[PDB]
Amino acid sequence: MTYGVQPTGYVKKPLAVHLAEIEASMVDLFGPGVIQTEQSPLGQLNGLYADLSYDLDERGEDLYQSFDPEQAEGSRLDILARYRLLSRRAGESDESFRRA
């Protein structure tokens, strides 16, 4: 696949693509004559879906990154540090802890 989890990492999908895919899918169902403009109810549904799915796409990227010590931040970084025996010193920032 071209988006999502890939060997090089998480290929995040743009919002314009999120919207274009859903519009094309609706054309596949209702024919090229279906009305999806911003004002119509289908355009309302498409815009909202595009944005919710971009948000979910971004949360997927965050979850993917949070499995790496050099990219986790805070309690997740602590979870991954307990594989190497580092316990966040009281008041130690995430920069100093990631360094450690």
Partner 1 sequence: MAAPSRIGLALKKNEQGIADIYLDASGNLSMVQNTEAVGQHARQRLMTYLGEWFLNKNVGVPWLRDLLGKGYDPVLAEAVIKAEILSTDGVTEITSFSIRFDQGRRALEAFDIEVTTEYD
Partner 2 sequence: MIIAFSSAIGPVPLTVVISEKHTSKVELTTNPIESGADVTDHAYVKGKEIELEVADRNAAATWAALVAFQESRVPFVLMTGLSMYRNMIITEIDATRNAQHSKILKGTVRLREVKIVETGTAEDSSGKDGTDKNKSSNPSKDKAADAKTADKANSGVNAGDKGGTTVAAPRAQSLLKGVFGG
Partner 3 sequence: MIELEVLDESKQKFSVILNDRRVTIELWYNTTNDRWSFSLALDGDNVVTGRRLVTGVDLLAPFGLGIGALFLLSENGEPPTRANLPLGLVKLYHATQEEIDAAISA
- Residues at the contact surface with partner 2, assessed by CB under 8 A: 14-17, 19-21, 23, 32-38, 43, 46-47, 50-51, 54, 99
- Binders of partner 3: how many residues, by CB under 8 A? 26
* Cα(35)–Cα(86) distance, integer angstroms: 58
Closer residue to partner 2 (CB): 34 or 63? 34
Closer residue to partner 3 (CB): 42 or 58? 58
Q: And the tokens for 82?
A: 């307990």
CB 50 within 8 A of CB 19: yes
Closer residue to partner 2 (CB): 5 or 27? 27
* Cα(81)–Cα(6) distance, integer angstroms: 25
